[PDB]
Design a protein around this ligand. Sequence first.
Ligand SMILES: Nc1nccc2c(S(=O)(=O)N3CCCNCC3)cccc12
Length: 338
Amino acid sequence: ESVKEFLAKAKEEFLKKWESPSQNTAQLDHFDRIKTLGTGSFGRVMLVKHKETGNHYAMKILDKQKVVKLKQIEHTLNEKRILQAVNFPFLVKLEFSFKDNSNLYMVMEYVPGGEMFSHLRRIGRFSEPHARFYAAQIVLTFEYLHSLDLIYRDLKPENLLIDQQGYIQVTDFGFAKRVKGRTWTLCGTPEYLAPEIILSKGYNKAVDWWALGVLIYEMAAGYPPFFADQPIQIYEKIVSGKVRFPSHFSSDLKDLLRNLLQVDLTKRFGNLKNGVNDIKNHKWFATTDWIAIYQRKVEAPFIPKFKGPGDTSNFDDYEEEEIRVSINEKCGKEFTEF
Ligand SMILES: Nc1nccc2c(S(=O)(=O)N3CCCNCC3)cccc12
């Protein structure tokens, strides 16, 4: 009953914000630009400092014209509407959002420890306890999100940031969506796509549990289970129903992964009658105190090395380009609700 009542309150609070989203809660000239943290085909993320409070934030800047061209309108509206409505210890906090003639802006808490991906590649692989600590946070986060009828659809190490306490902050809700039943959009990252996405089926939250299998495998092995030079070769491996495990994997880990990386979605853990509890009760998680993880009382495998809330040493270097704002409004109709 404790979990039932927790999730009932979580849904109530989410729905109130979902039905009345916040809008236009800061403006660009409230901030100083520090450094570019990441860059993509329709936006980038910049470390900024608020000029009045001195607080640092990660400001995601999306170019409206490029969002339209790349057919991401609904997705960017989803991202902001969801991010402003959720509240969970392992979900990045959206502090402000606004738009101008050219861009959409999402101003999040800056997570200074860097991507999980960087740390994974620097150490090679994570031990099973280390992988399990991160995996447990994802399990709880998906329990939360799925209970709100949300599917995440972008799980991968580059989207999981390590915070000052060594815990995960999930970022990038660009593919997150409120879905009762099935959805159909082809989106994600090749190595992490569930078979039913590749096969153009109507799919559900089971794709997130498949992606958790991929993530756990990649954390524990150092490389993902299905890889190849060309996406088509990756997809052939994904749909095949075959996966090979390193001999160093424990039997418990292999068993959990066979059930998450189950090609038949009707047999996949997280999508059966027992829901998330088939995962939470699996022997690989027998040492996990789920409540202690949620309360952030477990000592982390490592604390990232950084000097202060403005330190960018755990992130990499990108060309510093202008934030130009057109003198004419672009795509005003499409982004009215943002
Ligand atoms: N709150 C954040 N704090 C640091 C960085 C953040 C980023 S980010 O793009 O800079 N980042 C690293 C490069 C691209 N991969 C995705 C994660 C994205 C979203 C939120 C962030």
